[PDB]
Design a protein around this nucleic acid. Structure first.
Ligand SMILES: C[C@@H]1C[C@@H]([C@H](O)CC2CC(=O)NC(=O)C2)C(=O)[C@@H](C)C1
Ligand SMILES: [K+]
Ligand SMILES: [Mg+2]
Ligand SMILES: [Mg+2]
Ligand SMILES: [Mg+2]
Ligand SMILES: [Mg+2]
Ligand SMILES: [Mg+2]
Ligand SMILES: [Mg+2]
Ligand SMILES: [Mg+2]
Ligand SMILES: [Mg+2]
Ligand SMILES: [Mg+2]
Ligand SMILES: [Mg+2]
Ligand SMILES: [Mg+2]
Ligand SMILES: [Mg+2]
Ligand SMILES: [Mg+2]
Ligand SMILES: [Mg+2]
Ligand SMILES: [Mg+2]
Ligand SMILES: [Mg+2]
Ligand SMILES: [Mg+2]
Ligand SMILES: [Mg+2]
Ligand SMILES: [Mg+2]
Ligand SMILES: [Mg+2]
Ligand SMILES: [Mg+2]
Ligand SMILES: [Zn+2]
Lengths: 217, 136, 49, 105, 155, 44
RNA sequence: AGCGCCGUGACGCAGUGGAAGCGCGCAGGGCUCAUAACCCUGAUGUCCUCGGAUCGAAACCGAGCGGCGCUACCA
RNA sequence: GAAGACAUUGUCAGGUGGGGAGUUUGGCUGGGGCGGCACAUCUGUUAAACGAUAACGCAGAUGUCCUAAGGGGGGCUCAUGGAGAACAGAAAUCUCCAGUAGAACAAAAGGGUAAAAGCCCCCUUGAUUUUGAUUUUCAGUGUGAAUACAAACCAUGAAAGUGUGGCCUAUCGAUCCUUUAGUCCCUCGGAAUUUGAGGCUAGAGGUGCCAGAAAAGUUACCACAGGGAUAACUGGCUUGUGG
RNA sequence: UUGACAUUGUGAAGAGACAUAGAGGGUGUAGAAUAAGUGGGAGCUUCGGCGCCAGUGAAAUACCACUACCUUUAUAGUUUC
RNA sequence: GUGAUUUCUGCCCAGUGCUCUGAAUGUCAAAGUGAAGAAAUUCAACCAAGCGCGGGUAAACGGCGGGAGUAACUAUGACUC
RNA sequence: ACGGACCAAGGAGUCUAACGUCUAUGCGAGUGUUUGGGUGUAAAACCCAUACGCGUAAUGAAAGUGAACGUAGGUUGGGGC
């Protein structure tokens, strides 16, 4: 047994889906999320946990990611359908922080080739680190469609400064069996990153993009 | 309270198990100590019984019933002249009152196997090597 | 010490046991005494059995 | 050392009795769980006067431990324990080796 | 079928190894009162006229910088931590808490920025840029930044 | 000699440990300066 | 006799198996009538030798050299 | 007169406590001490051509490392030299010839291996289950390691076949206690149910003084039992050193 | 030495914690209003009013955010300094 | 502790000790409190002193460094690193 | 190397509980009277009931179950007849 049993989640998720699928018909997509709270836990004193796992299927394929990389990766990413940006156009963009301020905003994530290490910090500024989006490595043998599927599906848990975190673990328009599975994999992944496991969580809110933010515990 | 061990400066001279001074308990009750002191005070009488009457944090208070073995009202009156027998001299000093039989453990059953016919007598019997003429 | 193929013995003689040895030399005397007590009691309570 | 999280091996679960798929985890000891008879005896022996009553080990020599693998059949949930040799670093299902790759220095 | 994925840790092994007392050296590491320390002074003396040796040891804690002293017979064993240093590349430093990157792009946003004379100089050398390489010492479940170097080549 | 006093013994005459003694020390230990807030000559 | 440690730029010293760094010193220009201070810029190393293991050693191993040390007690 | 439900006193609980108590303070060792490890082990030699064989003999090594560096199959041949090919040079890649291994096989050393045991590639988990027998150390005990079958379930291959970890020789651990797995079994003894506890079979947590106590000194204030099994003076053998 | 219980009875006036709910932005520069944060993301309403874009910053603004402390507030009570 | 008089009694509070604060926090026993349980019990919060953190103190215990260059004969080095 | 000037007298593997191998004796699937009773020429000798010990059943942690397929098996030796 845990603090959460899949039965209680099964009954919250049903009317959570029944609201979005039946009642309110908005002209755009609806996304289900997970929000977590932390209690008796102090970011300044304690250890800032950091974890991510490969979620089985992507919660939202409608997010824009830019392919930093060398000639080989840009060549196989320009044919993929993902915006592949070179290394020699960034060469003197460091002149102005505004030139890269828009770069971080438009792309929901960044992944770069293994030559990112020497370059991406110093070629750019520290904005990407500040923004919470730092490029993740991709190898020459790693199929780039594999990473852009993986990096799009993975959820990252990070204790940055505040006791509240939130990862997105689905879109509404899936069948309900995989929704209860993934909402249940993400909660006990989150507790596994804590000192006392379930004894540090004090808030678990699951919901959909626009409506009834159900509390769980 | 407890019976502090009356060794000078707490220095017991022996093994660590016997190094205790403070958390040691007297094997007789305070009611038996009360009976001892009253019987010594009134050595011409025989302690019959005692009971609790009161207590505060420092003292427990008891009342002792004593019988006069010389009074002719007690020497006659068959229901009580057993106490005039010499065998009942200082029965409270030998643990023969109710509190003394309780502290000696004198009761029936398996819970009192150590102390039924007196524990030192039980120990002597259990620790006696009995040899017969035609050895068994 | 432990030596040879011999059974493990459990002779409980590590106390002052020689102070509590009872030898029943008085077996014959106490049997005579018991018969004497029975005879005197029979005489006292006669003819009760 | 690096061991996969998944492994096909023999399951003696009275319904498999054959090689089935297993999930691999590392064995963790578990809480000492007082009210165990040895813990009750120890508490009774340590109560009172007499000091420390049992040996207290001091002469540590080992620096590693044997790793025990907890194998769970995916068909009947029967579990089995396997023992590996001593190691300093142990990991499960991570970063299969790359053969012909340049050194990253 | 099953759930929760049985997420675990997959750990083992000791943070200290027992080696000796007389085999220690200055600039080596030793555990004193459960703290990791760097030896700066060790001396040996005979205890009597036909007795044996004892080692007096003076060492600085590798994290708090405090002096610790201890003494032991030269032939008993003491613990030595498994002190390790790691290269990282210096990304942003925002609320202290230097965010670092390994030889791969994997990030360590876990280590407090040093608040001492080395840490403030690190921040000043970081504000104008000139990407740094910071060394992290990580003995006995504690981590700390101890040095920083300007990259040599590839300007 | 050491049998007589905490300061006794030695191949030279010296106290050997701090002569400042805590208030919570026990009888036989309070030889020297007991619960001293400071020692040494006043005003340097 | 046995044992331990050290050797890095002219000097004093750091140093994470991926070709070496601090402070002065030195060099070039400037300011001054000139030197110093000051300002702007550069340069300086078989890491004591000679072999070995490693893809690659300043670090590890073997020797050789030069210094510093420690033990030296009961008789 | 002061003080007052506070102090005090009782019991339990945490701290402090060489003031005091009890105990300990390994072994081997050309006396002991300091040093070292010859204390559990492995390679070569000493070792005197079966086996065994000592020393604080000699030269070294071990407390690890590995999902492959384990298992099978396939294809190929290594170090090195010569001759050649823009930059390219003594050292970058390419080609041919010669090449018995002069390479490689995690790590000491020794042994072993060429259509392989090396290198590259394709699959995979036999590094599995149940026990018994055997070899070495040996008391023919344990522990560690290993060998050959049996009964299953598998991997690989066209197949013969091979595979019960690492090409072989080292790479490690009882009782008590704790913990997990298995049978879902046995017991809690007045009779049941459910917790809890205890059992049976098999792993782990560790004893490196490695057949496995829980352990700091000093003594010229010293004590006892002994020892010429053992040092310091004389004698004896030797004579490097001295002459 | 420190805490608790007992000894141990009789009383009042300022604080302060538990649970329900309503409130709340507190700032430096500056978008377009005075910005306490992080995740999602272009819609219901009589207002096209607001967000999207483009300017603005350390960080976007409609909306879902009864989520995250933090700062206040009125309770039938229950607890302590 | 030192040891008549005279004349002096330098520098060092990092360590060990002694001593003094705070409540901004870490550790934190028994009793008491809350929650889960059928209950034994388990978990959590609160949590005194001490410790920890931070000051003071050497007529407290005590301690009180290396190397190199440099003067118009050399040598030394007032000076300098 | 130590003990021994001389002589007399004394002066050191005992008894007990439990037990192993061997041997003797009795009876033998049984065996053991002597706790006790009876009796007596009285600590002897003689007589004795019921029990109890060991043995005739093992194995298992335990709940439990529990010894002939057969001339109580086959093969190889085997004294004696
Ligand atoms: C060191 C720890 C304990 C140790 C062991 O139980 C220690 C002793 C304790 C004792 O009093 N008697 C014994 O027979 C063993 C053990 O088994 C290790 C694996 C784990
Ligand atoms: K002693
Ligand atoms: Mg008790
Ligand atoms: Mg106690
Ligand atoms: Mg003292
Ligand atoms: Mg003393
Ligand atoms: Mg003297
Ligand atoms: Mg003592
Ligand atoms: Mg010895
Ligand atoms: Mg041994
Ligand atoms: Mg031979
Ligand atoms: Mg057990
Ligand atoms: Mg001799
Ligand atoms: Mg000569
Ligand atoms: Mg005086
Ligand atoms: Mg002075
Ligand atoms: Mg408590
Ligand atoms: Mg001194
Ligand atoms: Mg003699
Ligand atoms: Mg003589
Ligand atoms: Mg004589
Ligand atoms: Mg005689
Ligand atoms: Mg005799
Ligand atoms: Zn199965």
């Amino acid at each position: 047994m845990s603090k959460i049993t899949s039965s209680q989640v099964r009954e919250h998720v049903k009317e959570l889906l029944k609201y979005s699928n039946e009642t309110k018909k908005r002209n755009f997509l609806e996304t289900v999320e997970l929000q977590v709270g932390l209690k008796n836990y102090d970011p300044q004193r304690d250890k800032r946990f950091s974890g991510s796992l490969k979620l089985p299927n992507c919660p939202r394929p409608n997010m824009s990611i830019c392919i930093f990389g060398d000639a080989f990766d840009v060549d196989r990413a320009k044919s993929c359908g993902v915006d592949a940006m070179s290394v020699d156009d960034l060469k003197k963009l460091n002149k102005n922080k505004k030139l890269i301020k828009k770069l971080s905003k438009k792309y929901n994530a960044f992944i770069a080739s293994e030559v990112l290490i020497k370059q991406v910090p110093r070629l750019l500024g520290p904005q990407l680190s500040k923004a919470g989006k730092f490029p993740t490595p991709v190898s020459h043998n790693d199929d780039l469609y594999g990473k852009v599927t993986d990096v799009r599906s993975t959820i990252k848990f990070q204790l940055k400064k505040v006791l509240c975190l939130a990862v997105a673990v689905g879109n509404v328009e899936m069948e309900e069996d995989v929704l209860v599975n993934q909402i249940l994999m993400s909660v006990n992944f989150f507790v596994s990153l804590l000192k006392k496991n379930w004894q540090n969580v004090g808030s678990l809110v699951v919901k959909s993009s626009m409506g009834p933010a159900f509390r769980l515990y | 309270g407890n019976r502090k061990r009356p060794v000078p400066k707490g220095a017991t001279y022996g093994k660590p198990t016997n190094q205790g001074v403070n958390e040691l308990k007297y094997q007789r009750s305070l009611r038996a100590t009360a009976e001892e002191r009253v019987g010594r005070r009134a050595a011409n009488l025989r302690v019959l019984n005692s009971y609790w009457v009161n207590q505060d944090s420092t003292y427990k208070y008891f009342e002792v019933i004593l019988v006069d073995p010389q009074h002719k009202a007690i020497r006659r009156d068959a229901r009580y002249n057993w106490i005039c027998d010499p065998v009942h001299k200082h029965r409270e000093a030998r643990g023969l009152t109710a509190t003394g039989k309780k502290s000696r453990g004198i009761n029936k059953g398996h819970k009192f196997n150590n102390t039924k016919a007196g524990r030192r007598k039980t120990w002597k019997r259990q620790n006696t090597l009995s040899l017969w003429r035609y050895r068994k | 010490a432990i030596s040879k193929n011999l059974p493990i013995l459990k002779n409980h003689f590590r106390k002052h046991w020689q102070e509590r040895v009872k030898v029943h030399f008085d077996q014959a005397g106490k049997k005579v005494s018991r018969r004497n007590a029975r005879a005197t009691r029979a005489a006292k309570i006669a003819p009760r059995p | 050392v690096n061991v996969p999280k998944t492994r096909k091996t023999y399951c003696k679960g009275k319904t498999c009795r054959k090689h089935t798929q297993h999930k691999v985890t590392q064995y963790k000891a578990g809480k000492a769980s007082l009210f165990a008879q040895g813990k009750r005896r120890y508490d009774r022996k340590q109560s009172g006067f007499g000091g420390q009553t049992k040996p207290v080990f001091h002469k540590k020599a080992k620096t590693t431990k044997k790793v025990v693998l907890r194998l769970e059949c995916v068909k009947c949930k029967t579990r089995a324990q396997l023992t590996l040799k001593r190691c300093k670093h142990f990991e499960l299902g991570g970063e299969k080796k790359q053969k012909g790759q340049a050194l990253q220095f | 079928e099953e759930h929760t994925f049985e997420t675990a840790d997959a750990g083992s092994s000791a943070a200290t190894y027992p080696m000796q007392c007389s085999a220690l050296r200055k600039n080596g590491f030793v555990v004193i009162k459960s703290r990791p320390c760097k030896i700066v002074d060790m001396s040996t003396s005979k205890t009597g006229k036909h007795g044996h040796a004892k080692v007096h040891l003076v060492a600085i804690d590798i994290f708090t910088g405090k002096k610790l002293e201890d003494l032991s017979p030269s032939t008993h064993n003491m613990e030595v931590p498994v002190v390790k240093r790691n290269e990282y590349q210096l990304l942003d430093i925002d609320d202290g808490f230097l965010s670092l990157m390994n030889m791969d792009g994997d990030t360590k946003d876990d280590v407090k920025a040093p608040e001492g004379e080395l840490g403030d100089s690190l921040q000043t050398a970081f504000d104008e840029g000139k990407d740094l390489m910071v060394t992290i010492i990580s003995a006995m479940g504690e981590e700390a930044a101890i040095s920083f170097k300007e990259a040599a080549r590839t300007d | 000699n050491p049998v007589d006093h905490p300061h006794g013994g030695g191949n030279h005459q010296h106290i050997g440990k701090a002569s400042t003694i805590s208030r919570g020390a026990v009888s036989g230990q309070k030889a020297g300066l007991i619960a001293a807030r400071r020692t040494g000559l006043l005003r340097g």
